Design a protein around this ligand. Structure first.
Ligand SMILES: CC(C)(C)Nc1nc(Nc2ccc(C(N)=O)cc2)cc(N)c1C#N
Length: 260
């Protein structure tokens, strides 16, 4: 079982993600080089849905020159029936890697954080706010994290979604979503790389989980650790108030990423 994209042929090794009317496959070209092909079935896409895919593609295609911490997009084919995107495959997504992992070499954790910062700082320079960041949005390639998608088209699962990394102001927006919203979620991803759990992962009830995320007087456990800088990045990312929340440009000058 194989497929053609802009003439080149690729044989499916296996499937690695899905969601809505799309699939991601690990495939090989004729030289047995490996890629990930995303397949979108356009059969039932509404004009809004369609336009969100076109847009996501335009920007991904564009932003590749601007950072190497953004997934490679080699080619794509778009008809009225389907889309194929030929991308870089990498090794695995960050959500999978975390679950198959007890603890993380702190040097590797700070390396991963730098990459995440860089990729999101890039999409923000072009006016894009992801607003739904999770570990699944990042790919591990040669020891580097790369951002896989921009939040514009609908989300993929590697293989129910998740509510842990969701920022406060998204929930009170019920305007209002800014770049600081991404800092909350990057915050929850680092929190989890540090303290082996997302901030509210214990509290399995869902209504209550959203309650705790907005609740100013619910407070967050910051178990004391050697890296006091790391400690301070987490506290600054996780300010429930966004005007008080650290920015990405600030985060990039924080001692946690800059010192020693
Ligand atoms: C993460 C998800 C939604 C599946 N999408 C992707 N994944 C990729 N690489 C990958 C490899 C291996 C595993 C794995 N867990 O074995 C996962 C993921 C590469 C990609 N270019 C995309 C996309 N689009």
């Amino acid at each position: 079982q194989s497929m053609s994209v802009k003439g080149r042929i690729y044989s499916i090794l296996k499937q690695i993600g899905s969601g809505g009317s799309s699939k991601v496959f690990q495939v090989l070209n004729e030289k047995k080089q490996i890629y990930a092909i995303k397949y979108v079935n356009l059969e039932e896409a509404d004009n809004q849905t369609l336009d969100s895919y076109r847009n996501e593609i335009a920007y991904l295609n564009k932003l590749q020159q601007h950072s190497d911490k953004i997934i490679r997009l080699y080619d794509y084919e778009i008809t009225d029936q389907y889309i194929y995107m030929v991308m870089e495959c990498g090794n695995i997504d960050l959500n999978s890697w975390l679950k198959k992992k007890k603890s993380i070499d702190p040097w590797e954790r700070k390396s991963y954080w730098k990459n995440m910062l860089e990729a999101v700082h890039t999409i923000h320079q072009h006016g894009i706010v992801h607003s739904d960041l999770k570990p699944a949005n990042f790919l591990i390639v040669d020891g580097m994290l790369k951002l896989i998608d921009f939040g514009i088209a609908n989300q993929m699962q590697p293989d129910v979604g998740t509510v842990n990394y969701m920022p406060p102001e998204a929930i009170k927006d019920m305007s209002k979503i800014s770049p600081k919203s991404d800092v909350w979620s990057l915050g929850c991803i680092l929190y989890y790389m540090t303290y082996g759990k997302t901030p509210f992962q214990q509290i399995i009830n869902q209504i209550s989980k959203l309650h705790a995320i907005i609740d100013p007087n619910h407070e967050i456990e910051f178990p004391d650790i050697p890296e006091k800088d790391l400690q301070d990045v987490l506290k600054c990312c996780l300010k429930r108030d966004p005007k008080q929340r650290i920015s990405i440009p600030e985060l990039l000058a924080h001692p946690y990423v800059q010192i020693q």
